[PDB]
């Protein structure tokens, strides 16, 4: 029973990767440590795909054991239960960069389980867990175009700092996490104290450069102990079936994506898809339905993508840098402390602000130490916002993630306790959705806080940027629709005031994103939020 | 630009505001309803296509209270609203019960109603407001719906009826009644009373139905202005030939099956007939719709039972229209419990216990209209073995919460106050057998269990369920209905009370065109029924 061990320096810390001895029945398992903070990460990929599977089922479970800090759980049953909001957020930090690296077409069930088994209260387990998932996936043989690295970047004394400790973060104007391959950035999650576009871009570049040592060492560990890559291929191109679908659908789908109204467009697209499948199934009853939907999806994608690259008007008639129509309202609910209704195109957020006392502050029993929270931000996404029915139970992971993103967009302008000694709860109800709903929550929160009389330094706003890129040709899109997000190459969210950036989030679906592209996106994002802030000012420019 | 369509009208001493057109435009319909500072945002989404093999109507009503409506931050550990409370579940039922029968027979598209309380005046109850919201949203939607309905709370102060009394006014009221119905008929009644007469209870139902007509008229005027076009929906066309083939194989057999009095036998035979009939028709034609055959067979059952009621023939169990089933009353059945009772009416049985406790034991209810401590607890359990089935034993179902509250309201009128009896009292009703009304058996069982525990209740309390079969002007009111007579009949009409008055009245009417005369025959026939039940209860136990 022999462990294969690899050690390397990563900034000021020693990172240890261990595999071969523990959990030998998992597809791959890695014990990752960074100065006493240890996370055991396993991966299991099922050999066979479910016969009728049409979507890739990837699940990341991140869990913190209290014995990692020499603690017994504080709950009534004295046992770890359902993941906290913090554990859900870290699970998303692992999922987001790894998801686009599985080959298009690959639908075998993959589960990644990260368990924190030891913790140094100065070293955050999130980066350690991300390195573990990268190592385990690279070792597994599961089709995966990694490995990825992971880095936290701080900004202390106007200098970038790699993986700052919890004590060092207290003096930092930036808390940024960047993950990516050897070639490109894939994921960014950050909160900043109103830093410039150049300062934010430099942090992304710094963290991507620094994390190359992690990628190099995983590559060397894979050469030593990696299981052979799975013998897997995508379904071969059926040129004859593609032409048959195109003969029935292409011209109709090209016209359908000229319809601006979301509800009218989706209804028409559904009719086109339904009639094409029904016609083809009558000619041949053995034709695979999932495959026909895949060919139909490829046509939509090509129609929208090619019109963007050719410089033609977007789905709703806009040019590349046009923002949708805005409607800003304040004091919309009679008994709430502060309320706002923010509308951008077909996206709408009903946002409220509520004031409380120290009794109302949330107590977070977290692994790295107990902490009380005075600023609360909850984000609700009901199914009627997109004209659907669904389960309304407990915040979904996506709601949790967007609630935190919107909070990070507002945090920079919130007054501290010495200037406004109150607990503030912000609730954003998404009433309509067609892109970016979390950024609509940022604007709505700024308006609701001012309506409540909260003495923020500066109104705050946000937008989501998109991208269409083939080779060296690319177009950056301002204020993207839902369709432009799904058929596009990225979701690029920037929030901030007139003076700087409070939050930057990137979710890139391709390899090969460039420093220049991020620079153009950041610059175009600035003009966008300044336009929104101008409209917001007309309504309200000072707290009530 | 966003444009709201607003209609205001006076309703008693309040102003009701209806707003639609600018919020949640992707839902089928959405309305913001306000009644003096108290606001509920109600949405409906109806799916265009029915599911492939759907044979039941999927209607879901979700009612949720946001704590920001009262300017408060949630008291829970996570400082966020979670799973619906006992109160939110009950109000969801108050919305669901009158709207369900108004969807056309055969309509099986998925419909979801979501009501969110966004603002609250602590003197104006959001439940009536939410009911007007659901009515207005469903009427505007264009979804096949035979409304609109109104909603009214009726009090009884100084022996006079009061429309929508405030929370302060209810302290002086001998009645708390809610009635909902169309322009023509009452559909739903939920009430508790301090032992009022049959005439006093009926006058309240009539009063509230007349007062809510202004709500119906104003929704009608809003619908003519802003209503979406009514869906082009048709019931599946009547197949007379297929009916004849099913009737030729099953009607004569099902007629004999519904003369079998024993419940277990009579199903077991009904199931044999349905299985053999379907399997025979599939042996003749494998393309026949199995769901459609079940609907024709069910139409035969319904016709067999209903027409025998109208012809004046003996009921399924051989009883006459105003006969009550056999009664068995027991006291002190469990050795270690404070008070226990076993109450059996026919094939319905309830094991009921009573437990005395202290302050500590009183329930703290963190309600939106104000924090309240509850001294009297009533829990109702309906395990699957009561009807000879297997199933989940998880948390209480919505029907268990609703029936526990109904039985509680049937008992509250006779409970001693805190000066007389300074103890927390918990009553648990275990339904051991079911074949109609189990919640009324819980009322009787509670009365015996409370006396057995030595709780000095004012008087013994009892109840029954009344049924109805109505064609045109012809009708027969049924006493103490079976499960079959509830499911194939036209109403479930529950009355509870002592020798001297009614403690609770509940109506669930499945047809339009119920009449004042009918409700009065039911109330008088119900009075005789409970006096008979009380007489048997008196023989067993007459004092603590």
């Amino acid at each position: 029973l022999n462990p294969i061990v690899r050690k390397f320096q990563y900034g000021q810390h020693t990172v240890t990767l261990e595999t071969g001895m523990m959990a030998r029945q998992a597809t791959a398992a890695v014990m990752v440590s960074m100065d006493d903070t240890a996370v055991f990460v396993t991966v299991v990929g099922q050999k066979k795909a479910k016969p009728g599977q049409d979507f890739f089922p990837l699940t990341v479970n991140y869990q913190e054991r209290t014995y990692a800090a020499g603690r017994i759980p504080g709950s009534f049953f004295r046992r770890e239960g359902r993941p906290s909001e913090g554990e859900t957020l870290i699970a998303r930090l692992i999922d987001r960069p790894i998801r686009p690296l599985f080959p298009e077409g690959f639908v075998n069930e993959v589960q990644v389980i990260a368990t924190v088994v030891s913790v140094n209260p100065q070293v955050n387990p999130d980066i350690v867990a991300m390195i573990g998932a990268s190592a385990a996936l690279s070792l597994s043989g599961i089709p995966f175009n990694g490995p990825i690295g992971a880095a936290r970047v701080g900004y202390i004394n106007d200098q970038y700092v790699l993986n700052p400790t919890q004590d060092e973060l207290k003096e930092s104007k930036l808390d940024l996490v960047v993950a990516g391959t050897e070639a490109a950035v894939l994921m960014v999650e950050s909160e900043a104290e109103l830093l410039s576009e150049d300062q934010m871009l430099g942090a992304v570049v710094f963290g991507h450069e620094q994390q190359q040592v992690v990628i190099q060492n995983i590559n060397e560990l894979v050469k030593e102990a990696g299981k052979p890559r799975w013998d897997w291929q995508p379904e071969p191109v059926n040129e004859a079936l593609n032409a048959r679908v195109a003969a029935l659908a292409e011209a109709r789908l090209s016209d359908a994506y000229r319809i601006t109204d979301k509800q009218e467009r989706y209804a028409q697209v559904d009719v086109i898809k339904s009639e094409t499948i029904a016609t083809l199934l009558a000619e041949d009853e053995t034709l695979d339905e999932n495959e026909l939907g895949e060919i139909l999806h490829a046509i939509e994608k090509n129609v929208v993508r090619s019109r963007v690259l050719a410089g033609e008007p977007r789905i709703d008639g806009r040019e590349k840098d046009m923002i949708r129509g805005l409607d800003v309202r304040t004091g919309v609910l009679p008994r709430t402390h502060g309320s706002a209704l923010f509308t951008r195109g077909e996206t709408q957020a009903l946002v409220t602000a509520t004031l409380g006392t120290a009794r109302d502050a949330q107590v977070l029993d977290e692994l790295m130490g107990e902490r009380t929270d005075t600023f609360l931000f909850h984000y609700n996404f009901p199914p009627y916002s997109v004209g659907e029915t669904g389960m309304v139970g407990s915040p979904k992971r996506r709601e949790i993630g967007h609630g935190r993103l919107a909070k990070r967009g507002v945090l920079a302008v919130m007054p501290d306790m010495d200037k406004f000694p109150y607990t503030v709860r912000v609730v954003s109800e998404i009433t309509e959705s067609n892109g970016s709903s979390s950024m609509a929550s940022v604007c709505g929160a700024s308006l609701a806080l001012m309506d409540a009389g909260v003495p923020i330094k500066a109104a705050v706003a946000g937008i989501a940027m998109g991208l269409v890129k083939e080779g060296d040709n690319y177009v950056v899109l301002s204020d993207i629709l839902g369709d432009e997000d799904h058929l596009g190459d990225m979701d690029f969210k920037v929030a901030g005031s007139r003076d700087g950036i409070s939050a930057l989030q990137m979710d890139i679906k391709i390899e090969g994103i460039t420093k220049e592209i991020m620079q153009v996106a950041l610059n175009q994002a600035k003009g966008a939020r300044l336009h929104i802030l101008g409209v917001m000012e007309q309504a309200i420019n000072a707290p009530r | 630009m966003l444009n709201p369509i607003v209609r205001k009208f006076q309703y008693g001493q309040h102003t009701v505001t209806l707003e639609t057109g600018m919020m949640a435009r992707q839902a089928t319909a959405a309305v913001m309803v306000s009644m003096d500072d108290t606001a509920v945002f109600v949405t409906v989404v109806g799916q265009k296509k029915a599911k492939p093999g759907q044979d039941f109507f999927p209607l879901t009503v979700n009612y949720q209270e946001r704590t920001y409506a009262a300017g408060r931050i949630p008291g829970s550990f996570f400082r966020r609203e979670g799973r619906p409370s006992e109160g939110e579940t009950l109000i969801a039922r108050l919305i669901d019960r009158p709207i369900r029968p108004l969807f056309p027979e055969g309509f099986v598209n998925e419909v979801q109603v979501i009501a969110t309380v966004v603002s609250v005046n602590p003197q104006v109850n959001p439940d009536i407001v939410a009911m007007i919201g659901a009515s207005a949203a469903l009427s505007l939607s264009g979804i096949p719906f035979n409304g609109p309905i109104g909603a009214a709370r009726v009090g009884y102060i100084n022996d006079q009826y009061v429309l929508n009394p405030t929370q302060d006014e209810l302290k002086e009221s001998k009645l708390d009644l809610v009635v909902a119905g169309t322009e023509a008929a009452v559909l739903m009644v939920e009430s508790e009373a301090e032992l009022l007469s049959e005439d006093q209870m009926l006058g309240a139902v009539v009063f509230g139905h007349e007062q809510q007509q202004v709500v119906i008229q104003n929704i009608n005027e809003l619908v003519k202005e802003a209503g979406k076009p009514r869906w082009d929906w048709q019931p599946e066309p009547v197949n007379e030939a297929l009916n004849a083939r099913v009737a030729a194989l099953a009607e004569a057999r099902l007629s004999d099956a519904y003369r079998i009095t024993d419940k277990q036998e009579r199903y077991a035979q009904v199931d044999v007939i349905k299985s053999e009939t379907i399997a025979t028709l599939l042996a003749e034609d494998e393309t026949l719709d199995e769901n459609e055959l079940g609907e024709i067979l069910h139409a035969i059952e319904k016709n067999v039972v209903r027409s025998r009621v109208l012809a004046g023939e003996p009921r399924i169990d051989g009883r006459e229209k105003d006969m009550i089933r056999g009664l068995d009353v027991r006291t002190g059945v469990l050795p270690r419990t404070h008070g226990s009772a076993l109450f059996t009416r026919g094939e319905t049985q309830a094991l009921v216990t009573a437990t005395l406790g202290t302050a500590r034991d009183a329930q703290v209810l963190d309600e939106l209209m104000g924090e309240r401590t509850d001294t009297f607890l009533f829990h109702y359990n309906f395990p699957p073995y009561s009807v000879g089935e297997t199933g989940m034993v998880g948390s209480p179902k919505r029907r268990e919460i609703g029936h526990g509250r109904l039985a509680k309201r049937g008992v509250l009128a006779v409970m001693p106050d805190m000066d007389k009896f300074p103890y927390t009292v918990r009553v648990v009703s275990e339904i051991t057998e079911s074949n109609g009304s189990s919640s009324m058996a819980s009322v009787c069982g509670a009365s015996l269990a409370l006396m057995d525990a030595g709780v000095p209740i004012k008087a013994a309390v009892a109840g029954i369920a009344m049924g109805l079969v109505k064609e045109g002007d012809n009708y027969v009111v049924l006493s103490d209905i079976l499960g079959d007579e509830d499911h194939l009949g036209d109403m479930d009409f529950k009355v509870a009370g002592s020798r001297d008055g009614i403690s609770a009245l509940q109506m669930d009417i499945k047809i339009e065109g119920i009449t004042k005369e009918i409700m009065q025959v039911a109330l008088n026939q119900a009075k005789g029924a409970r006096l008979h039940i009380l007489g048997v209860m008196e023989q067993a136990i007459n004092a603590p």
Binding site: M322, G325, L326, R329, T330, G345, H531, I540 | L2, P4
Partner: peptide, 21 residues
């Protein structure tokens, strides 16, 4: 007495636009 968008205590709106230079 009423909730909704018609009750807005303050209001501002803009048509779809390209931002300043």
């Amino acid at each position: 007495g009423a909730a909704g968008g018609h009750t807005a205590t303050h209001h501002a709106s803009a048509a779809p636009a390209r931002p300043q230079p």
